[PDB]
Design an enzyme around this catalytic site. Structure first.
Site, PDB file in Angstrom:
ATOM      1  N   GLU A 150       0.824  -1.208   0.000  1.00 23.22           N
ATOM      2  CA  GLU A 150       0.000   0.000   0.000  1.00 23.22           C
ATOM      3  C   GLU A 150       0.863   1.264   0.000  1.00 23.22           C
ATOM      4  OE1 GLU A 150      -3.967  -0.502   0.789  1.00 23.22           O
ATOM      5  OE2 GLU A 150      -3.539   0.893  -0.852  1.00 23.22           O
ATOM      6  N   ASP A 151       1.627   1.423  -1.082  1.00 22.11           N
ATOM      7  CA  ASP A 151       2.447   2.612  -1.323  1.00 22.11           C
ATOM      8  C   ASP A 151       3.474   2.821  -0.210  1.00 22.11           C
ATOM      9  OD1 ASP A 151       1.686   3.388  -3.833  1.00 22.11           O
ATOM     10  OD2 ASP A 151       0.174   4.831  -3.163  1.00 22.11           O
ATOM     11  N   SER A 152       4.352   1.835  -0.059  1.00 20.96           N
ATOM     12  CA  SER A 152       5.489   1.946   0.838  1.00 20.96           C
ATOM     13  C   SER A 152       6.620   1.101   0.277  1.00 20.96           C
ATOM     14  CB  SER A 152       5.135   1.519   2.267  1.00 20.96           C
ATOM     15  OG  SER A 152       4.599   0.210   2.290  1.00 20.96           O
ATOM     16  N   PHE A 193      -0.319   4.497   2.587  1.00 24.03           N
ATOM     17  CA  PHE A 193       0.913   4.919   3.242  1.00 24.03           C
ATOM     18  C   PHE A 193       1.762   5.833   2.369  1.00 24.03           C
ATOM     19  CE2 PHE A 193       0.162   0.380   4.615  1.00 24.03           C
ATOM     20  CZ  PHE A 193      -0.643   0.739   5.674  1.00 24.03           C
TER      21      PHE A 193
END
Ligand SMILES: [Mg+2]
Ligand SMILES: [Zn+2]
Ligand SMILES: [Zn+2]
Ligand SMILES: [Zn+2]
Lengths: 66, 144, 44, 48, 263, 45, 102, 49, 48, 97
Positions: free
Chosen positions: B18-20, J47
Site C-alpha cells: 500500500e504505497d510503501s 501509506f
C-alpha cells in the site's frame, strides 16, 4: 558534488577511479570501454561512476571568504 | 535532482504494501539520499525615537529580566553566537534587549532556535539595513 | 541534398534555445517596457 | 471573406517549419529548410 | 566430510566451490562475512579548522568510509571493553590530516594517502589506510583552492558491519548453486520457450545438463555452492574467510557455554 | 573584542561593539563572524 | 535632470548589471552563471510576476444566454485604447425576447 | 477570546503498514508515548509498579 | 470472515486475520512474487 | 502511554462511524504509527504520506466505553449493508491465492 567513496549498493571502493576514468575518456575511449578497463563488472558500480556529476568544480570557482 | 537506485519489484516481506518501500540500510549508511538542510533566522534593531533603540547584547541575569528558559552561555559578548557551535532546540542564537519607555527594565527580545530543530551554526552575517541600524542573519546547517 | 532528419530538428531547437533561452518572455517584456513604455507614458 | 491582422501584445505563438506550397516549382510539398541551413547553423556564420 | 575447491585466488577476491555442506551453513557463512567480521574504521572526527567548500559532516562521513588495514584487528579491544577513560592507545588509532593549497593558481587534491598514522597500539599492524600500490594516491577526499586549508584529527576504532556499513570488509559476495535447475527450486518465466529465453549460468559447464529422458530426483538436495568473495583491501580474502569461520565458531561456542552455565 | 572577516576583501580584523559596522580596509558594509576556535566532534556516520 | 523615483530592475534584463561581465566576473561577485534571471529583488526577497490571463480586447464575441432569461443572445466587445492597452469601457448588445416569447 | 491552558491529550503523524500487528493493535513511537500521559489512581494492587 | 463473525465471535474473527496474514506472508516471503514488462507483451498471433 | 492501553484513532475525513476506532497500543521505536493492513480499507487510507490522529481517554468510564463499544473487532461487520468491511487485501490476498 564529489565522487562517492563507495558504491551505494554493493560497497566497492570507487572513489579512487575518478581521475583514471577522466584520463581514459581523454584519449577518446568509449565510456563502456573505460568502465571495463577499470574492472567495474557489476552495473551498480557502473552507474555509480557513469552518472556522477562533478559539481565541486563549480564550487571552487567562487573566491574564498578567507 | 535525484539518484539512480537499484530497484527490485517484489513482495518480499509484506512491509512494502500500500504505497510503501523497503530501503537498503547499508545503502543509507553509504550516503544514499543523504542531504543538507539550511535554515536562516533574521533579526534587526528598531528605532523608537531620538535615541530609544535596541541592541544586540548578551542579557544579564540581574540587570536584564524576562529571561527565557533556554540557555544563554552560547552567546558571545555582542549577543551573536560564533559559527561552528552545536546547539539544540529553544537555545538562544540572537540576544536582543529593548529599553523600557518611561536596571531590571530591559525587555528580552531574544530569538531562540526552533524547538523541533537542531544543527550547527553554519554562518553568521552582521551588516546594516537601509536606514543604518544593525542587522544579523544566522544560517544553521543540519544533516537529514 | 538530403531529407531533414530528427537530429536536424534537434539542431534547430538547440539554436532556438541558444538564442532565446527559457525566460525570454519576461526579459523581453521588461526591456520593451523600460526602453519605450516609460517615455511614451511620460509624453502622453 | 475576412482578412484580419493582429499586432497586439500578449498573444501566444509557437514556431513552425514552412512547407513550400507554390504550384510553380519542383520544391512544392517539401520543407523549405535544407541541409545548407543546418550546416550554416552548425558553423555559426553564413558563407558571405 | 566437507570439501573446498578454490577456483581462482588473488589478493582481493577469491572464487571457490563449496561442497558436502548444507545450504543453511553456506548462507550463514556468507552472512557472517557480510556483517559480523570485525574491522577497523574511523568513528570519531575532530575538525580543528576547515575552510573547504564541503560541509564538516560531509568530509567526516567521507572519512568514515575510507578502508583501513585491519590485519591485526583481533588483538585490539572494543571501546566498551577498555577501562580507560574515553579512548586510549590500546583501543583506538589516532590519525591526522593537514592539507593546504598555496598560490593564486591551481587546485590541490587531498587524497587518502595524506592520512598519517600518528599513534596506535604498537606494534600491531593496523591503522594504515589501504593502498593499491606504493605510488597510488588512493581515494579522493577533497579539493582545495587558494587560501583554503584542512586540519583534521581522526580516531579509528574496531567494529562490525551490523553497527554501520563502514566496517564491512566485503563489497559483494556472489553466491549460487544448481546451475541447471535440477532441483526445480525455481520456476522459469517465459513467453515461448524457457530454455532459449534464459541465459546460461557461468558455472553451467561445471555440471552435466540433465538428459531429456531423466526423471525428477525428489530425494536430492543442494550440495555444491559456487561463491566469489571480494574485499575492499582492509582484509585479504583468505583472511576474511578464516575470520568468518572463526566468528561463527565463537558464536556457537558462546551459545554452548551459556547452555552449560544455565544448569 | 570579537574577530570578524570582510565580505568583499576577506580581511580579518576585530571589533569592540563601538566601531561602525564596516570593513576597516576596503570599507565594505558586509562582514561575517570568524569561526570559533573550539574543537568540534563528529561520529563519521 | 530631476529625480522622480526608483524603478525596480528585473535581473538579467538589458538594464541589469549582470547582462554583461561574463562567467569570470559573475563568479567574482557571488552570482551563479546557471541563474536565468527574470525576477525582481524586493527587500532582499526574490519576487516573480505570474502572467495574468485575460480575454482579448477590441473583438466581438457572441454568446447564447441561458434558458430562464428574456435575453436570447448577447454580442459584446470590451473596447480598450491601443495606447497603453488599458481597458476603458465595456459595451454590450442583447437580443431581448426568447423564441416566441415577449 | 480565551487563552492559557496546557492540553496535550492528542497526536497526529504519518503511518505505515506492519504485517506483524494484530487487527486491534496500533504501533506508537516511544516519543509519542512519552509525550502523552494517562492519570492512574494509586491503589493497593498497582502501587508497586 | 462473515461466517466466523456470526459463529465464533469478534475475538476469534480478529485473530483469524492475524493467523492468515502471518501464514501467507511467511509463505510468500519464502516463495517470491514480482511483475515485469514482459507481463504486458502479447505474442505475434494475438497481436495479429 | 503503555501497552494494551485503549486509544481512539481517526482519519480525516470521518465519513462513516468506523473511520474512528479504538485500538490497543504497542510501543515501538521510530517515528511512524503502525497499523494492520486490513484496517486500512475501512479507514480508506494509504501509506503515501497520509496522517492520522490519536486521542487518549482520561477516565475509567471513557476507557471502558472505548473497549466495549468502539473496539476494532466489533466494527468488522457494518450495519450499512450487513457485510464485513475488513478483508484480506494486497500481498496477503495474492499469496493466499
Ligand atoms: Mg494517501
Ligand atoms: Zn557496486
Ligand atoms: Zn582504551
Ligand atoms: Zn574589506
Amino acid at each position: 558534488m564529489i565522487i562517492p567513496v563507495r558504491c551505494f549498493s554493493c560497497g566497492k571502493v570507487v572513489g579512487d577511479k575518478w581521475d583514471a576514468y577522466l584520463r581514459l575518456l581523454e584519449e577518446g575511449k568509449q565510456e563502456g570501454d573505460a568502465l571495463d578497463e577499470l574492472k567495474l563488472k557489476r552495473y551498480c558500480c557502473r552507474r555509480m561512476v557513469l552518472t556522477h556529476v562533478d559539481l565541486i568544480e563549480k564550487f571552487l570557482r567562487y573566491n574564498p571568504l578567507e | 535532482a535525484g539518484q539512480n537506485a537499484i530497484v527490485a519489484i517484489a513482495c518480499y516481506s509484506g512491509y512494502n504494501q500500500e504505497d510503501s518501500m523497503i530501503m537498503n540500510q547499508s545503502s543509507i549508511d553509504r550516503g544514499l539520499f543523504r542531504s543538507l538542510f539550511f535554515r536562516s533566522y533574521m533579526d534587526q534593531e528598531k528605532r523608537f525615537g531620538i535615541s530609544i533603540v535596541e541592541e544586540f547584547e548578551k542579557p544579564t541575569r540581574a540587570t536584564t529580566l524576562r529571561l527565557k528558559h533556554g540557555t544563554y552561555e552560547k552567546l558571545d559578548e555582542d549577543g551573536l553566537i560564533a559559527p561552528g557551535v552545536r546547539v539544540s532546540g529553544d537555545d538562544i542564537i540572537i540576544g536582543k534587549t529593548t529599553p523600557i519607555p518611561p536596571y531590571h527594565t530591559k525587555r528580552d527580545a531574544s530569538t531562540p532556535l526552533r524547538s523541533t530543530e537542531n544543527g550547527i551554526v553554519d554562518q553568521v552575517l552582521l551588516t546594516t539595513n537601509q536606514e543604518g541600524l544593525k542587522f544579523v542573519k544566522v544560517r544553521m546547517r543540519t544533516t537529514k | 541534398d538530403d531529407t531533414i532528419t530528427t537530429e536536424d530538428c534537434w539542431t534547430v531547437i538547440s539554436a532556438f534555445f541558444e538564442e532565446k533561452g527559457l525566460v525570454s518572455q519576461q526579459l523581453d517584456s521588461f526591456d520593451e517596457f523600460m526602453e519605450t513604455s516609460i517615455q511614451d507614458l511620460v509624453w502622453e | 471573406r475576412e482578412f484580419k491582422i493582429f499586432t497586439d501584445v500578449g498573444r501566444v505563438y509557437r514556431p513552425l517549419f514552412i512547407v513550400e506550397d507554390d504550384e510553380s516549382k519542383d520544391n512544392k510539398g517539401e520543407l523549405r529548410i535544407t541541409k545548407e541551413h543546418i550546416r550554416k547553423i552548425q558553423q555559426g556564420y553564413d558563407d558571405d | 566430510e566437507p570439501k573446498v575447491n578454490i577456483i581462482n585466488a588473488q589478493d582481493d577476491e577469491v572464487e571457490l566451490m563449496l561442497s558436502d555442506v548444507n545450504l543453511s551453513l553456506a548462507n550463514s557463512l556468507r552472512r557472517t562475512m557480510l556483517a559480523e567480521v570485525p574491522t577497523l574504521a574511523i568513528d570519531l572526527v575532530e575538525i580543528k579548522m576547515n575552510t573547504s567548500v564541503l560541509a564538516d559532516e560531509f568530509i567526516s562521513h567521507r572519512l568514515g568510509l575510507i578502508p583501513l588495514v585491519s590485519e591485526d584487528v583481533e588483538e585490539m579491544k572494543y571501546s566498551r571493553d577498555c577501562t580507560c577513560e574515553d579512548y586510549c592507545d590500546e583501543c583506538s588509532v589516532v590519525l591526522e590530516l593537514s592539507a593546504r593549497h598555496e598560490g593564486e593558481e591551481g587546485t590541490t587534491d587531498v587524497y587518502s594517502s595524506s592520512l598519517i598514522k600518528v599513534s596506535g597500539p604498537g606494534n600491531l599492524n593496523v591503522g594504515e589506510p589501504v593502498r593499491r600500490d606504493d605510488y597510488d594516491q588512493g581515494i579522493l577526499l577533497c579539493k582545495l583552492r587558494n587560501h583554503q586549508e584542512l586540519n583534521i584529527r581522526c580516531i579509528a576504532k574496531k567494529g562490525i558491519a551490523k553497527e554501520h556499513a563502514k566496517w564491512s570488509p566485503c563489497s559483494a559476495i556472489a553466491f549460487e548453486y544448481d546451475p541447471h535447475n535440477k532441483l526445480k527450486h525455481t520456476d522459469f518465466w517465459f513467453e515461448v520457450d524457457a530454455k532459449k529465453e534464459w541465459p546460461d549460468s557461468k558455472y553451467a559447464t561445471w555440471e552435466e545438463p540433465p538428459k531429456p529422458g531423466e526423471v525428477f530426483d525428489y530425494k536430492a538436495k543442494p550440495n555444491r555452492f559456487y561463491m566469489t568473495v571480494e574485499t575492499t583491501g582492509s582484509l585479504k580474502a583468505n583472511q576474511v574467510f578464516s575470520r568468518g569461520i572463526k566468528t561463527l565458531q565463537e558464536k556457537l561456542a558462546n551459545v554452548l557455554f551459556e547452555l552449560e552455565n544455565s544448569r | 573584542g570579537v574577530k570578524y572577516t570582510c565580505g568583499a576583501c576577506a580581511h580579518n580584523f576585530s571589533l569592540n561593539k563601538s566601531d561602525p559596522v564596516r570593513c576597516k580596509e576596503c570599507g565594505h558594509r558586509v562582514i561575517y563572524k570568524a569561526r570559533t576556535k573550539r574543537m568540534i566532534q563528529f561520529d563519521a556516520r | 535632470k530631476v529625480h522622480i523615483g526608483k524603478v525596480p530592475i528585473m535581473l538579467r534584463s538589458k538594464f541589469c548589471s549582470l547582462r554583461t561581465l561574463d562567467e569570470v566576473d559573475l563568479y567574482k561577485m557571488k552570482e551563479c552563471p546557471y541563474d536565468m534571471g527574470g525576477y525582481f529583488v524586493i527587500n532582499g526577497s526574490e519576487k516573480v510576476l505570474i502572467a495574468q490571463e485575460r480575454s482579448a480586447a477590441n473583438i466581438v464575441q457572441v454568446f447564447k444566454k441561458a434558458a430562464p432569461s428574456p435575453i436570447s443572445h448577447v454580442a459584446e466587445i470590451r473596447s480598450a485604447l491601443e495606447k497603453g492597452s488599458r481597458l476603458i469601457s465595456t459595451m454590450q448588445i442583447k437580443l431581448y425576447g426568447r423564441e416566441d416569447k415577449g | 477570546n480565551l487563552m492559557g491552558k496546557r492540553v496535550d491529550f492528542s497526536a497526529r503523524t504519518v503511518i505505515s503498514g506492519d504485517p506483524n500487528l494484530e487487527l486491534d493493535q496500533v504501533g506508537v513511537p516511544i516519543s509519542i508515548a512519552k509525550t502523552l500521559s494517562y492519570p492512574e489512581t494509586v491503589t493497593q494492587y498497582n502501587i508497586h509498579r | 470472515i462473515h461466517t466466523v463473525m456470526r459463529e465464533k465471535g469478534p475475538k476469534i474473527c480478529a485473530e483469524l486475520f492475524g493467523n492468515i496474514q502471518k501464514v501467507v506472508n511467511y509463505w510468500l516471503l519464502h516463495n517470491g512474487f514480482s511483475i515485469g514488462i514482459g507481463d504486458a507483451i502479447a505474442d505475434a498471433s494475438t497481436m495479429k | 502511554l503503555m501497552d494494551d492501553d485503549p486509544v481512539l484513532f481517526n482519519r480525516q475525513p470521518s465519513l462513516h462511524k468506523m473511520s474512528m476506532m479504538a485500538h490497543r497500543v504497542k510501543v515501538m521505536p521510530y517515528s511512524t504509527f503502525r497499523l494492520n493492513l486490513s484496517v486500512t480499507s475501512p479507514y480508506n487510507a494509504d501509506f503515501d504520506g497520509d496522517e492520522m490522529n490519536l486521542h487518549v481517554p482520561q477516565s475509567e468510564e471513557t476507557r471502558a466505553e472505548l473497549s466495549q463499544l468502539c473496539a476494532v473487532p466489533l466494527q468488522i461487520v457494518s450495519p450499512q449493508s450487513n457485510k464485513p468491511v475488513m478483508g484480506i487485501v494486497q500481498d496477503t490476498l495474492c499469496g493466499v491465492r
